[model samples]
Target chain A: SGFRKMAFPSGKVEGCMVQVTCGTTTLNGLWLDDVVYCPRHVICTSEDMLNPNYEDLLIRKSNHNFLVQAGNVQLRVIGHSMQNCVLKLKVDTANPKTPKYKFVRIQPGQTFSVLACYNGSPSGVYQCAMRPNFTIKGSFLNGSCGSVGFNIDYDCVSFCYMHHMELPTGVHAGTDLEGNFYGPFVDRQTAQAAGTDTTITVNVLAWLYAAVINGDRWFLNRFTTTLNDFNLVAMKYNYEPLTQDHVDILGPLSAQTGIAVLDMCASLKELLQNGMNGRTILGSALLEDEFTPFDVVRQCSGVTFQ
Target chain B: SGFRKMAFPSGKVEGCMVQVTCGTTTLNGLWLDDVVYCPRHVICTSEDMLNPNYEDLLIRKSNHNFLVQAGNVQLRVIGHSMQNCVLKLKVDTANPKTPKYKFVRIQPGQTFSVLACYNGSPSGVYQCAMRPNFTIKGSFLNGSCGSVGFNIDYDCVSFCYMHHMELPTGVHAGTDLEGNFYGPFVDRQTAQAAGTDTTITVNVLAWLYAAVINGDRWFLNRFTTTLNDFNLVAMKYNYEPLTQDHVDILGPLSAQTGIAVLDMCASLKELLQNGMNGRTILGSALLEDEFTPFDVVRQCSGVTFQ
Candidate 1:
């Protein structure tokens, strides 16, 4: 091998030290892995941070039984086109410990703001010098690391009815250049050929996995998504959620589920119509559905309200 | 004068400069400030920035039009718990060469983003290079002026009662701790006991200043805030918007010309009904007898229908 010319301090992580700050009171516990409250700040020399659970085992803001689940937490890797996505950030503690979180709303201008708020007990004060959540506010950039770009084949196909609706189907379909219909439907052939299927599917194989819903429907599309479909469902019903209920209500086979499902569907629809966007996603099958009804949902704002 | 230690190159004009290839057929006639079409890559200098005028100066995208006079503008310096104090802002440009600009909404968190867009456009590209807009992208701390410490003292007064109804008098009388109204009205004595008087004047003041319209009224406030009021009147509708229209509407009142005279009473009534927050001060008197009735509007997510 040629003479190695490795700089003593590498720019990436080489000079960086894992830091953590105590909130109100300096916590004193054995900072162990997989067990519980790891007291120490720095990991053992033998421990590998890449061990998946290293960072997970380390929870910030040690107060009020606040502990973060180290084993199976996810960091959503958002795609370029994605406006918003959620993750199933788990808290292992029983009590309402201060949850570490961050979020960003796609803004009009070039930049977006991230809002990160940590719940602190009356005594607990969040310390950043010790642990940096990698964000100022609760915001992060939609960049290559936290977010990635995928090669997409976006189609702007045009459609013209045969002897049916003579108007070009593409431009008259909806709001975009391809047109959209909202009120009444013309015939099937004349209903505008779904405005030429324009799709931009991502190939983020590792991040976007299949929908973890009920059985039978266990098929993988994208390996994973930046969003957490499970936690989203729980969030919809105030965390008191059930997958069967979701399957029965918003399943593809609506008629198969009958009026009971319809009633639930109506309720779900109302919740979606009224809930925040996050809750709405949890309540609906937008996870599996290919057709993105952008015209309808785009009208809604406020992530809190679906 | 004692020699002072100059801050070590605290900032740079344009972080860095590299060469970009220019096209032969350059729009050389265009002066500085003008958005000239430089074939693909071209070297632009300070001299080329003299003309700021352009048919369309798209620094980035098309939707973001930098027309300051075309919309409403607000600059509120906020700190402490001084809520309900009247706050208003307006801007107009007499520079005929510059496009008419106006802006409707100007909140604290999003100020830098809006300001930077203008900062670069007006100051020539060189100044823009010096004063780069802070953004999360490009560089982590770029335009990251850190978190602004502005505890705004906006009048959180509730202003969503029906026509002619008395406003909630005083601070604690009608609104619960959550800045929402508990009751629409209270007897004069009850109003006094609660905190202040229940007189129509006080009610109007309270509505125009202290209360938050809670759920429904908040959304209505944004909905009714159209580009017209947001861009035209609220921010830029100064002493004379349409001289004929003003005279026709207010008749003899238009002649009086009240510079700083914001008719809060009338504005409160109108805003509660129409949800317009347009107003401008001409010296000591308010320009329009009826400025935008923003005080009448409130922030209630459940107030309006989507």
Candidate 2:
């Protein structure tokens, strides 16, 4: 293992893919089990596996210089650690690059996204990276700086707002787009825990279904944000939705029930980091059927293995 | 309840639409809080409530001879029963007419996709509506037809692939082109039960994320039919991504160790679905830093909920 080195802003990126210092000592592709993530373009290239060439593209976005007034809104990061933080976008992607921003610093023991920016600039994607001054060896920048073992626990997420399309993967002789294209990609998983690991269960299916179903729908879009406000309002009236046909097996949550509409939306907002955008209508059905809201809400309980 | 008529070909649809008509009353905006789902486009049109207006757009592409060889593939129709169930496409906005395709009889429990004659042409968007005869007492075509009440669950997914662009909702909204865009969108439980969910989970996320990040950066002319290959391959590797130091607690599982990678990813996937996609990353990290191979294998034990 090489001893990693770095300093401020542009320091060692923990999860980045870097070419080996000695080109000859390339990454042991075989050694890479589950942790190694390949780009979609690259997978098609791997079919032959002889001359490995795959397009690996990475995206990172951040927001800086947010309007930070005195008491109007306290200054601080709403994520993990100062070292492990994210720079969020204040506005939409169409804004080019606005300079108005702020640096939110999350101290130890604080829940992420604790601060509310405002009603207008709802949160967007956050550019997350590690800080230079922090060190994992229980030491600081230099011997002078104190040690703060790497905050392995901090979580970072990217934001998006749209539905998806599929492409299959299979053995193809030709090296073109059409030939490379397969039925659908295969998925793989790696588990490290023993015993029944009652770990977290993110609502990918529910969100995919919800964001696409509810985001831009007619009844749900009447609100300014086009964010299923009807269902939010209706769900508020009772746990039931404006659409009143589902046979409630769990009994009626009330045609109008639990959590504030905004809070429920916020919870959805949190779950849909990438899926949520200013003009997002891909998530309106979040409260309704197929990928039922009950399933999402229940899955999001964040249960973990002992 | 809808009455059973005749049996149409199962999974034999070039283009199909599920219309919910309640005789004189308009059930176009059917809002059943439970199983039935109306996509975002459908929801948008449903907002008007009493004033129902679902316009037919440009006559793009309508091929009827699509085929469905797989037994799992189906085009189940559910709603009020009627004497006839014909698949129609609209043309001429001012005076819309169903010119080419004729009405066909549909028996209850029958599904349709495309017949052999409709094969080999292509698949595109067109107006797919079912005209069912209504009864005075009940929905001859109500409960059983529109919702396609197939006993199976569904997750809205995309199947085709193109240049990695953030398409709002495929090309068209509120139409079958975008609806059922992807696959056998299964749930985590189903995936786990079938022992294929983790693979699907990793494959879906990697592909979606890769497309977003490298949509334009790396131009690989290989995205014509499907982009599944790239993503599926990306899931199982150990590419050590570069990031600032101390941001992520370099666990025992680097691109090299390949430990606990699956557990963390599964947890991350769960967290994404659990309503934390946008929440701080710190709130969604994995519990353990390492795990044995037994937990990460492709067997049933490895598919435990994180």
Candidate 3:
């Protein structure tokens, strides 16, 4: 049993670490010992399992560079190296909404986890944003659910359309800004009356629980930034970054000892030129709360890891 | 210039991390902006550079597996994806042993280090055991000596033959264990008057550095072990591992707070079945030293890193 697929071009997916390599019938002398693997992060629908398989259908006919829509298209997902699988979301009762997202199922019980083989160990560092927009899944804890070795380190975050403070909530951050994305508001007037553009995600991590969470500091310093049209757009305070050169010396040694140097691999482009130009929020990435992906995808996306 | 190469099978190479993915001029609509890379870990000579081409020599016929010696053979080294190169060592006026080891030069003068591109940064964590018997070498900090993007995480430490206190000088454990192998002595009466076989290696990390290093505690617990014909051969004290299974509960929760857990990724087989059976020596992998591979392979293996 083997299947594998991964696709992330849009963003906000992270800390996904999966390592599984288990096999022994002697290196590769055949019966590679029940090759097994199962991992998922997806979203595809309307009668699936790659219907009529024509390059998994995106049915493109020339028109050069980036253009495909076998039904608004989807590419890179479902990872199967041997046992191959994908198909779910068909809601019960005959054809109720009939497999809408075409596929999405990694329903393991006990909070699902991976990275094991030479006889298991390593199930403590977990986080899964899941996202499943296009897809992401894993495999190989095969046959007996335990022989996985491929190696994956995850992180892709870019879904931010911030208007966090500088006013204007009537919304319209859409020119090509991917529909005003934003997430986690709390106060700030019901997030300026919910105009939808609030999707800045990491799923995010909590810092000392971030004092019960207060966000809005550049929307939690753009969650820990990776990309969203670059270092998070929507700046306007006269925006003069790239460290104003000799940037009038350190943003006052980051409040608590140069803001304790920062974390999450700490290299926001080398702390934005050493001493954090005009210090962007720092109460520990504004307590985002993805650290533990909320109980590992919150009780298995809302169930176990059997 | 772009170039790359890596090879490690025998042992002791470790913690090596390299990651460079630099290419701009627009992801590649061309001008790929002078792609560049340069990494090194090698050993291949006899008028080198994959000479006379032909599966790069090794000239064989039908021997099932493993045997290639266009002169003791060497593969998986010189990794060059673009500019391509390899050749050096003629000593001087020509033939002075004429490049004996075939190829070995990563001279980079100012303490060499890599992993940079979207505009440099990162060159602090360093170490290079650089045995270069078979090889390793990198490239693509290219042309202008920058734009490097290729990920690497390193570690491979094995070379042990320990007769450590089980005392023995006139050696011969060989039976395919790869000849004696033991290194770093200091005391124990000149390692029983040297018979050659002493080569343990980690280039080893210090721990407080193990109170002036007192190996023999299973030869510094097999120098953080990886493989030397298995948990480091030469045991014999009636040897009874696999944690003797609850046979009597943890050699007394490892002395100082379960011997303060342990390090180097711990999980010595899940701390030898959690709680460390028969307590195998701790004191922190006994001052191995290679943290700073004695100066990144000592002034570039006794030269520079430029």
Candidate 4:
């Protein structure tokens, strides 16, 4: 332990906690809060320290269920009901006693948003089975509302169709670098339409994990900052963190399973990582899997069309 | 502030490092490196400043505990044992200092692989419990041994599987997507010829993250150049970069939680945008969600998976 002295242009600046340790050696200094004139210290604006405005940033003005943030985008569940209508689904089924479920009603043309991350891992579906008072129709083009049929889509339904391939069990299932089987799926609605039965899929968990490992700051900072602010939104609405108990009750009712083991593994890993539990090992394994943009390109290159 | 000029093959470059008034603006140059060409310059090896050796690439080839980089493949751990040998398991007994626990022993002619991905979140169950050791007396037609046998003779003599499934409750208790929790055990040890339980799984974190957000050549150069120079074949092993506090402790674990909120937000946004994150307000939601090869095909098509 020794003091590595230095001469600064501004003489000896004070009021800073500068600490650097390499192997058994250590260096300490009194650094500044807003400035770092030395090369040894890198500025770190950890999210924990910053308190963001959750009410203004995360909560949708029309409703609290529809959380919003600048960069964190969600697959909003909007409906044009034949009349004024409401929708309900488990937001955080991982809770017990009081799972965070929601029932919100909006004007025919109005929409509300729900979280579509972690494929609803303990968070529930992005947009759940909305038992609206009126019939909802599905359409390819938003202009032709009822041209197709009556229904609401799973936020991840489209994502699943795009990111995954059907395997014998479900979608892409296989072993990892460790030969551990991964992937399993929630039953995919074979024929989704705008009928009384509308199933919406939002693989938020899987994609969220993918993006984190991708580490694109442009994407990550926006997503993270928004989420950091969500704590305020969650508290404002009297919601607890997603818990295990709630998820159990909502699991079967929600379409969140069925896929190849590998895909399932990745999705779950993302959930735990998001939850901050199983991420250490999972993140290590994912990093090993070379989940890079380049690797994404490589994997994406091998598509055999039907 | 005046233009800090420099000459290059193209011509004398003009107007750079332009300072705009926050309080006051100034133009200075100790900053000119290398191609400000004159000895007065020669400082811009900035990218070159951090010369990291990439030849040895990223691989940890020391004791078996720390494996190296490969095509991201791992030997894997399928079973544990208590013989004249050793066995260890970090199976989450949920205790301090001894959170990892497990002890068992199985036969030699029994082999299996287990799952190792995103630390078992609410989306459980990826791989299945394999059964081979019991009557895996012969090989499959593909020269691979032990194809069927809904049974397994353990290499680990005894180990309770009950503690994990029920977290003070049931295995499939919690919910997110669906409640079908999944993860099966492995029975490693088949055919006495190979001998010893040889299991391996590679996890490359530093390199992957290095490649991910390490857009700066300075930081990357120093980090990567060091890794690239670790050629075991060349007998040069003087490097200590992956520190405990920096990576293992603070690496995946910290980054995991901070970013998930971001990732979850992004996933939801992507679900909406392509559908896309808090990202719409962040930027245009990245429509690259269909970046998956299969999705590319799906989107490229007339958009009909049905």
Residue-level lDDT tens digits of model 1 in A1-306 = 000000111011100111112232121111111112211222212233223232343333223333332222311211111011111122233322212211112111111111111111010001010001111111111110111100101111111000011123211111101112221323233223332221111100000111111111222222221224533543553322323533332333333323233233333334333442322121122222221212111111101000
Candidate 3 lDDT tens digits, B1-306? 000011111101111111222222110000111211121101122344233332343232122121111111211121223222211111111211111111122211111122211112221111122121211122111111221111112221222111111123211111001211222222122233323222122222221122212122332242233333223331221111212221122222223222322322133323323432323232121122222222222211112110
Per-residue CA lDDT of candidate 4, range B143-253, in tens?
A: 011001111111111111111111111111101011111122111111122111111100112222221221211111211222223222112211122222223332342
Task: Give the poorly placed runs of model 4, Cα more than 4 Å off.
Answer: A1-63, A66-306, B1-84, B87-113, B116-126, B130-306
Instruction: Give TM-scores for every candidate, taking all chains together and pairing residue i with residue i.
Output: 0.16, 0.18, 0.18, 0.16
* DockQ, 0 to 1 scale, candidate 2: 0.01
Ranking by TM-score: 2, 3, 1, 4
List, residue by residue over A1-306, the lDDT tens digit for candidate 2.
Answer: 000011111000111111111111111000011111111222222243333222221122112222211112222212111111111212211222111222233311111110001111111111111111110111001011010111111121111100011111111110111112111212111221112111111122233333333232222222232235535543443323322232232122222233223333344434333333423333132222212334323222211110
lDDT of each: 0.18, 0.20, 0.20, 0.18
For candidate 4, the TM-score is 0.16
Question: What's the distance in Å from true for residue B96, model 2?
Answer: 6.0
Per residue, candidate 1 scores C-alpha lDDT tens digits across B252-272 of: 222222311134223433443
DockQ for all candidate structures vs. native: 0.01, 0.01, 0.02, 0.02
Query: Candidate 2 on B85-148: residue-level lDDT in tens?
Result: 1123221111121112222333211122211111111111111111111000111111111222
